Every structure is written in structure tokens, then in C-alpha cells.
Amino acid sequence: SSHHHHHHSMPDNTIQWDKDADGIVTLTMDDPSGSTNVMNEAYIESMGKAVDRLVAEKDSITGVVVASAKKTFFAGGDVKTMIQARPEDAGDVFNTVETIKRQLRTLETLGKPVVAAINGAALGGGLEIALACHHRIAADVKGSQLGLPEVTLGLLPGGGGVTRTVRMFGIQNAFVSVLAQGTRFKPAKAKEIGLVDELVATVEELVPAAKAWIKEELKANPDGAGVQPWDKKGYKMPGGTPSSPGLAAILPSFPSNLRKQLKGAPMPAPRAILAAAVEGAQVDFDTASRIESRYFASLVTGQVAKNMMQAFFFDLQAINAGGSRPEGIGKTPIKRIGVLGAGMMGAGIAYVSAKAGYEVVLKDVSLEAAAKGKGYSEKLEAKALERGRTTQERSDALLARITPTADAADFKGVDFVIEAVFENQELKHKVFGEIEDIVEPNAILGSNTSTLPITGLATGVKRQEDFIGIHFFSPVDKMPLVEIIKGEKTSDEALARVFDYTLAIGKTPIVVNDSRGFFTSRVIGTFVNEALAMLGEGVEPASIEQAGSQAGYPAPPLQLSDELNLELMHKIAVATRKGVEDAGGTYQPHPAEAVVEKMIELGRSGRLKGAGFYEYADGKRSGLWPGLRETFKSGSSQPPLQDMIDRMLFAEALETQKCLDEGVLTSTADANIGSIMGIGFPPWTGGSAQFIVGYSGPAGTGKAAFVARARELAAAYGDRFLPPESLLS
Template identity: 35%
Template sequence: MQFEGQAIRVQKIDSGLYELIFDLQTEPVNKFNQLTLSELKDAVTQLSAVKDIKGVLFSSAKDSFIVGADITEFSSLFDRGEAGLVEKLLENHAIFNAVEDLPCPTVVAINGLALGGGFELCLAADYRVMGEKAKVGLPEVKLGINPGWGGIVRLPRLIGIDNAHEWICTGVEKRAAAALKDGAVDAVVAQEQVREAGLDLLRQCAEGKFDYQARRTEKQSPVKLNQIEQMMAFETAKGMIGAKAGPHYPAPLQAVKTIQKSCGMNRDQAILAEIKGVAKLASGPVVKALVGLFMKDQYVKKVSKGHVAKAAQVNQAAVLGAGIMGGGVAYQSASKGVPILMKDINEAAIQLGLDEANKLLAGQLKRGRTDAAKMAATINRIRPTLSYGDFGNVDLVVEAVVENPKVKQMVLAEAETHLADDAVLASNTSTISINALAKSLKRPENFCGMHFFNPVHKMPLVEVIRGEKTSDETIARTVSYATAMGKTPIVVNDCPGFLVNRVLFPYFGGFSGLLQDGADFRNVDKVMERFGWPMGPAYLLDVVGIDTAHHADQVMAAGFPERMSHEGESVIDRMYSLERFGQKNGKGFYRYELDRKGKLAKRADDEVDALLESCVGAACEFTDQTIIERMMIPLCIETVRCLEEGIVASPAEADMAMIYGIGFPPFRGGVFHYLDEMGLAAFCEMTAKYEALGPLYQPTEKMQQMAANATKYFN
């Protein structure tokens, strides 16, 4: 039997043994698109008809096995409605069931990533051999859905209920050792031996040394748990998983409920339960938002790849300023394999930067995410220096000194004289104009902004800011370096606050306005956290630092006086004058102290109300909806202004910047998705209630035109 398609081919190995090879010709990785599924169906049908068949090996000709379903195709199924989705899922299950029902033993050679539908195919086979560098998993909950091609049914029967809850409800990728320990795979071998080991196991099965039918029967039968065991397994999990997922992400809890419902059924009944659970989730708004974010993230990565393709590689980096930020940049660069010089003007600052890097590495070591050898190698990539001696060999320099324009201009101008003519100089600034800083430089075309977010090792976003004279080559190299550091770079144009801070401060303006009208900041925090923000505005200001926020607020007020200036003393001004800087000195809107684990814990501070009395209004009750509207309207309108003015190139990039930069609730899909879901007509009508609050609450003319034409930002 021979089968040759565009995604799959089948070849005969030995007498009665066949190999089905995934090799999607149109893509760099294997994925389950309609072409692959169609060819899999045809190939398995033909294999089922071979009279002398003794075994089938499933393998991949690419570095990955199968990375999952083609989300660009699969997401369109959600528009079919529940009945249409159920029909399509039944078709896909029939293909995977046919794999499981082949009249011979089956083995999968997992040589690389096998995720989502790719891993569900592995589960349909009788045995799984995994390369030591491969990863497997069911990440569907990250898109707001559940595994829908048999993962809910087969995985609990292989690895047990508790393990399946952890795998499915977290959506984590599992390395080979963990997969073997839990029983999800049967063997782990060296990467180059995966195919041969899989073939050897298949031959042993064909010779009758392993009872593949018993394994198959176990996968297709009800889970062997009595009622008490089921109650213990599921009721505890519901409480823990439901609490961790929260009310806005229903997929993890739905997975537990579906596993519970299906574990007492045979395969075909259980599959119907799985399909119904997926269809129920697919009809909700969270899936649309999270799938949309996945697509936007892919788009942002594609844009970055376009820059990287044009860029000279950064082989040697440097950072100016060895404080917490400089140390964080040095750690991130070194941990990703890019050597970096860390320069400062005194030994104490150098030591602070090294201590920061060592602290982060020690945490990695403690959590088992690195070992002593890798830790030493990372530290050795950070070379502290008090001079510019080796800067002639540096490809890109990140300036990370104090946020003061005069100091930055002086340091940048001095550094430029020690760099090669084609070296890139980037300023890590959150508010200072790149065009203004460039005036002190002889080669402004080699200069741009590179705004890291604190803490550097955790925050995924880097704003790459283009000045008026910044060259394309400079942007390309900076994007390439940010990508090499494991960050998501988004290119924006220069303006006060750039994109993220420009949008954030109208949000803080809404907060200050609420307090001036008598709102309780603690209640505002609670409402916005229930809305989905990781922390309310008062708590966020404490984390950002009141002194930092006060400085940025002045920059924004000077840059956009018609919208962002304010009369009198605001709550941010008041906190700053009282030197209540938030977490950095233990007191802000809340007070902070170390808990038993050595982490800063937020506590109520009864002194704050009296301290704020001079700049807040008489106590007034606001509905949750009013608080949400007064907070969200300024943020949304300013984000739209940034798009209309060309500060950010696309709604997709803006949405990802809001998610990665300030924690916009992912289940709401980003600012532009949020506006599309509400409808611009409804949004503009809502803003009319707050006309008296000033320009921050007035939509742009283009927004009003789009509202009149029922236009959306995303098709």
C-alpha cells in the first residue's frame, strides 16, 4: 500500500509494517488543517483495508510532531453555531477513532512538539515513544475551550483523574520526564533514536510481546473508580480549580465537569459528552476573545520576524546603568545567550546590578528551572565595567540611567563617542521624548527608544520607539535584540508616554476624578479587579511607584494639556508630597510588609483617608457600572487616538500592548476587541453621559463616524 499526499505519506517498512509520516508541504510545521485531516482519513481508511497489516508507526518528517489544530481554520467553526460545531467535531472524532481502531498495534514516535490535536492523535494510538527534548500537552484552556478531539476522554484513562486535571486544566506543556512519570508516554529515548525506538516497539507488539488490545480496551472503557473515589477526585478539584481560574475563565472548571460526566461511560458515549462541553464553551464570549488574542499574537510575531529578517545579529550588547533595571536587562540578555557589558560609574552600583542578576538566577535554581552550570554560564555572560574600554565591539547599547532628560542626554552623547559607527544606541525611558534625546547625538539615525517594563524578567512587552530620524536598520536590530531576549517587541512612534503610558494615564485620570467626586479608592480597586484587571488603580499606582507616576503625570499633562492637565492637587500629587511612594518605601494607598515567604503583602492603612481629605470630595456611593465606565472610557478613547495618529500601526498591536504592558483583562480581548463587542454606537452613547467631565470622555470624530456606519476595528 502506498499513499502520497501534500501533508501525509505512507510507506511500507517491513512485511506487514507501515509508517504514516506527517509532512505538511505548505507549512514549516505540521498542523491539523482541513488538508491534513482529510488525508489522514483517507490514509487510515486504506491502511484498515490492508489484509496483512501487522502494525503502523506514526512519525513526522519535521522537527516538530504536530503543533495542534490550524486555529485560523478551526476558529471559523465557532460561527457555525453549536449544531454545526458538534457536527464537525463528530467528523474529526471519527478519524481519530479510526486510528484507535486499526486492526493492528499502533505506535507514535514523538520527536518534537505534540500539542492540542497533535497530542490527541498520540493518545489515540496504543503506545507512545517520546524524544528527550520533545514536549506534549493540551493547551486548549488557554484559548477558552477544552480538548475536543478525545483528550478529555483518553488522557484520564491513561494517567488517572488527578493527573489529567492538572494537565488539562492548566494547559501546560510537559517535558519528556514528566510525561513518562505520569504515564502519558511509554518510553523516553535520545532525540535521534525516536523513530528507531518506536519501530522496535512496534515490531515487539507485532510479535505478540505486548498486549496492545488490553491497552486499547482500557482506554475505551469507563474509569475504574467507585462513587466515593469519584467524589473525592472531582469535588475537591472543582473547588481548587474553580478558585484558581476565577469567574471569567470557565474552561478549566468545564473540563473537570466533563471528565466527571464522561469517566463512567464507554468511549463513544464519553466522546459525545466531550463534544457537548466544547460546544457549550465555544458559544461564549471568552473563546472569541482568547482566540482573537492568539491570532493577534501570531500577527505581532509575524511583524517582528519581518524586522528580524532584515537585521544584523546582536552578538554583544551593553547596558548603561547597573541599578535594578540595568541588572534586570543584563540578566535577561545573558540568560538568553547574548553576552552583555554592564557599565556604571561606581562599584556599588555595579554590585547592585550583579546582585539583582544573582537573585533572579538563584530563584531559577531554587525552582529547578536551571542548574549550577547554566547559572554560572549566565553570570559569565555579564561583564561589569567602569569604563567604555570594550564598547567599540558592542552591537547595541541600552541606556538605563535615571529618568532625567539632562542626565540621559549627557550619558547618551558620551557613550556614542565610544561606539562603532553602525552600533545602535537605545534609551530605556518610559516618558522622555526620543526626538528630544536624539538632539544630543551625532548619529540620531542609530538611536531609538527601548522601553522595558518592570520587572524586566517577568513583563513580556518591550516598546521599541521610533524617532523622527531613526533608521529602519536601527528599528530592525532593536526588534531583533528584544526578540532574542524572549520579549514581544511592538514598534511605536514617539509621543509623550509613547503608547502604553499615554493610554494608562487617562485611566489614572478617571481614577483621580472618581476620588474627587467622593468615591472610595478601595471600592474602585475592588470593582476594577472584579472587572478583570489584575489589580485596581490604587494598588497599581503603589506598584508602579507614586514618584514615578507623579513624574509621568506631569509629562503627560505637558504633552496633552487639553485632556491630561488638571487643576488643584490630585490624589497622586498628594501622595507624592507625603512621600508615600507605594511598595518601594512600604506605604502608599496601602501599606506593605513582608510576609512569611519574604514577599510584599498589601495591608489596609487606616491613616490614608485623613491624609487624602484635602483632595477628595464628600463620600459618595457609585454603582459598579458607573465606576467601570468612568475608568474605561478615557483608556479606550486614548488608545483609539494612538491608532488614529499613527502612534501604533494596528489595532492588533495595540491590543497586545495593552495585554502585555498593563494587564488589560485577556478574556476581554484587548481595547479594540472590547469596543467591537460593545459596538461603537453603544460606546459613544455611553460617553454622552459624561460630557461634563471634559475631553477625556469625548470620542473622536472618526469613532463617531464609525459608530454611525456600524464599522468595526476587526472583521
């Protein structure tokens, strides 16, 4: 009933009131306790006072303008508060979002126009405030974004974002275009899809254009001023309501298609969004809004939202703020990049380096090889001109920065070297030997190495202080992580330069201490090894791939093993066995190694040789090899699907814990973002480290529930699932 959260009973005010001689009120949001406006308790109380005043003075108010005094318009909900919400707080969470939407609903139905003056980023609750207005004007400035990214944090737009966008665009368009993926739009795209109505060049023109629109709206359309389309008697929802035969014929396919897209992964936010959108479209606006609040409280008090808020807000913020960057190092600009190797990795590194605006010299052993490496960038620009994401004159300058060559003399003037040749220590020693004296004296010597330790590779060059690991991931144009490995003789001066270069090409960096396998390759190895062990035990390969997809991985493990090449995996198992047998120990082979050698003996070592666990024809993947079931007696072992899912997730979660104990990783933030962005650990877990403190199954939640499930897995499948002592008590 009230615009305030409490009927009984000291927050700082965040809104400035200004009524001009025309009767136009300007609400300027300016939270003094931070650099951005956020739906905290200060905003809620401040907006409640403003809305109360708008009602009390309604006889002398002609229009309203909502504006901001920060760089951004409004950032959204308070993540620091939402991450602490417990299941017993569901009533308080529900009451908070109901109060927030009560304020916006009154603003929406004052009987007079309200205009949002969007000066910067309007995200989440920020856009929801703007959606409650009758007209939206956005400044076409740099860095401005608009969208509802709540699903990215395991949440949903609970301040009316679902209800209002469904009223604006219908169920299908709102869900696909705005809600389901949380897409962030630039002001030009926002007007194109319908989130914004008008654009201006600078932020100074917003309030004047807002007041001018109010003056024209009151004269041109006096009957519809301040009335949203859904508050008119003849409102018709675009695409129809669920009770109309047109939409009712395709509506049953929405949850199945969503389940197909998610592959059965346990991520509840998209389903909750779809349910709220459809259920809300069956009832009046206020009933729809209350339903939205109930689904919001269900997500906020759940565990997945806590996982995704931890990784995609806090962990990403700690990384993007130099959490693993050395202290007090000045920036050293980069003039020219030299990429050694024109394979898929080296060609991808050259593309993302040229797309960032750098001059790149792409060298291989032959000019024919370096040219087809540049052709990798040419095929990406052609698909970028067809879709229409870049111009011809800008795509011309991109490919012009890539200079394919086969002569080491063309590395003259290169102050940044990225090697991407075959995994071989003396090969990388030879390749760096030809080039370390032709490049600049202070040039960085980077190596895209999977497993070979950086300390050993550094001996092959003279200046070991500028030698560093710069690990990329295939395909380089789409994978956003760069695993920076610090060798023993690697200086902090070279750490910062690669850190800056990673940010310059638009990628996220993690810093890892030198060790065989580093973090990404070592952890992803336990993932594919766990699946191959299931194949050897007799589990149907179709179930193994289903367990990987329903676990949340972007690619099923047998399909991934083919891309990784089984001869690389056998080579890694040999290097691991040699280190144990040279120290006098007895090597315990992972049960997957017998499966790797079996496939190599059968001449099916992966996709490069056109035969692996799948069949390949015309370069496309056809299906699982029919001879697979006869080779491993598939079907003889039928464990429950959740056991297969947990064996894969736990193998990686446990290996992540070892990497933290051994000092490979320095922070759980790097562990989480590195596992998510590097090797594709399921995002609903929040990362392979968050998976431990946030595990939820039929046997409870928390680290203790994680250890119990690990012990249950160890009793049935092997001692490798035994939790280390750092997780016990």
C-alpha cells in the same frame, strides 16, 4: 456512524498508506497544501479513508504506526476556520469534532497495537492523535514540543484531549498539569509526566522502534495488545472517580480554587475544561467524549475564543514574521552590551542580556551600586539552582558575562548601549555624553524611557541615526515585551538591529512612533487614573481592587499605582499641563490628579517610601491604609461593580484608539500584543484594540455594542468616555 463528515456528495489527500510484509500499516501524514499538518477538511476526509481501510483489511493487519513527513508531527486544529464559527454553526462544529473523535476511537479499538512516531511538535489536535494511540515514541530533537495549548486560545482539547488525559492521569493531575494552562513540554518532560512512553535520539529511529515495539507487544502481551487501560474490565481511574469518597471530599474545592486563580475574570475556557473533565469522569468513555464536544462547541462559537485566537495566534504570528520590521536590512551581530544604570530596570536588562549569551558591562555612578545590580542576577540564579532549571557550570558563565563597574572607560568595545537612569532629559543627555565616544562607532544608543520623547533625547548625542527607544518593563526577567520607539532622526537601520536584539533575548517587539507617553505608558496611565478617580468619588478601595482583578488585570490598580510611584505620576501630569498652557490652552485636569496630590501631601507616595494606598512592613505589602476611607469618604459612592470594571477597560480601549488615529501605533496587532504583554491588559479581551470590535455585554456584541456602552459610561461618569469619530458612522 460514519468516519466521514458527510453522508452525501473534493479534498486533497494528506495521508500515505504503506503495509509491509509483517502486516504493519504506516500512516504518514503529509498535507501537500502547507508546511504543517492541520485538522482541516483534507485531514478529516483523508483519515476517514485510512480508518475505513484499516477496518476492511483488519484480517491482514497486525499493527499500525502513525507518523509524519513534515518538520513537526501535527500542529492541531485549523484556526482560520474555527475563528469564523458563529452561534448558528454550533451544530456543524459539534458534528466535526464528533467525526474527528469517531476516527480516533476506531483507531484506538482495532484490536491491534498503534504507535505514534512523534518526529516533531505535537500540539493540540496533534497530541490528541497521539493520545488515541497505545504507545508514544518521541524523537529527542531540538524545537520539539508536546502539549494541549487550546486553553491559550480560549478553546479546549476537543479531539479527545480532555477525555483521554483524565482517563490517563485522573481529574486533578490532568487538569493541573496539562489542561488548565496548556503547558508545552519538551520530549524529556513529556516522558517524565507520562504523555510519552519512550525516547529516541533521531527521527530515523522512530518507525523502526515503533515496528519493533509492535512485534514485541504482540508476543509479550497478546491479550492486551491494542487495548487502552480504560477499555479493560478492571479499570480504576487514578485519584478516583467523582463518586469515590476520597476525591468527593476535595472536589468542591476545585471550582473555588480555579475561581481564586482567575480572580473572577470572565474567561470561560478553564471552567469549561474543568466541567468537561469532571462530568466525563462520571460516565463511560464514549459518553464522556460527546460531553467534551458540547463544551468545545460552546467555546468556539463564543466571543472570548475569537478574541484570544485573534491575539495569541494571528496577531502574534504577524509580529513574529517581521510585520513592523523595516524591509531589506541585513543582520548586524552584537559583541558587547553596555547597560547604563544598576537599578531594577538596568539590572534586569543585564540579566536577560546575559541569559541570552551576551557580554554585558553594567555601569553605575559607584562600584557599590553596580555590584548590587549584579546581585539581582545572582538572586535569580540561586532560585534557578534551587528549583533545578539550570546547572552550576552554566549559571557560572551567566554571571561571568556581567561586569559591574563605575568607570566610563569600561565601555570600550561596546556596540550596543541601553540606558536605564532616572527620567530626566538633561541627565540622559549627560550620561550619553560621557559614553558616545568611548563605545564603538556604529554602536546602538538605546534609551529605556517611560514618557520623554525620543526625538528630544536624540539631540544630546552626535549620531542621532543610532539613537532609538528600547523600552523594557519591570520586572525585566518576566515581562516579555520591548516597546521600540522610533524618533524623527532614527534610521531604519537601527530599527532592525533592536528588532533582532529583542528576538535574540527571547522577547516580543512592537514598533511605536515618537510621542509623549508612547503607547504603553500613556494607556496604562488612563487605567490607574480611572481607579484613583473612583477613590476620590468615594468608592470603597476594596471594591476598586476587586474590580481590577475581576476585570482580568494581573495586578489591581491601587497596588499598581504604589509600584509606579505617585511622584512619577504627578511629574507626568505637570508635563501634560505645561504643554497645554504653553500653547495658550486651558488644561482639563483628570480627576485623579487631585487624589495624587492629596496622597503626596499626606506623605504616602507609593512603595518606594513605604507608604501608599497600602501599608508596607518588612518590604511586604500588609493591607489597605486604614486612613484611606476617612480621607476620601469611602462608601459614599457605590456604583455597580460592572461599571467600575468597564470604566477601566474602556479608558484603555479608547486611549488605544487615539494612539491608532494619531499614528502612534501602525497596526492593531501591535496594539493588542503590546497591551497584553506590556501593561497587562486582560488576555480574554484579546487586547485593548480587539476589545472594541469584540466587546460583549448585556447590550449585545461588536463595535456598535462597544459604542453604546461607552456612551452609557459617558452619561454617568464623564466626557472622557466619548467614542472618537473613527468608531462612529
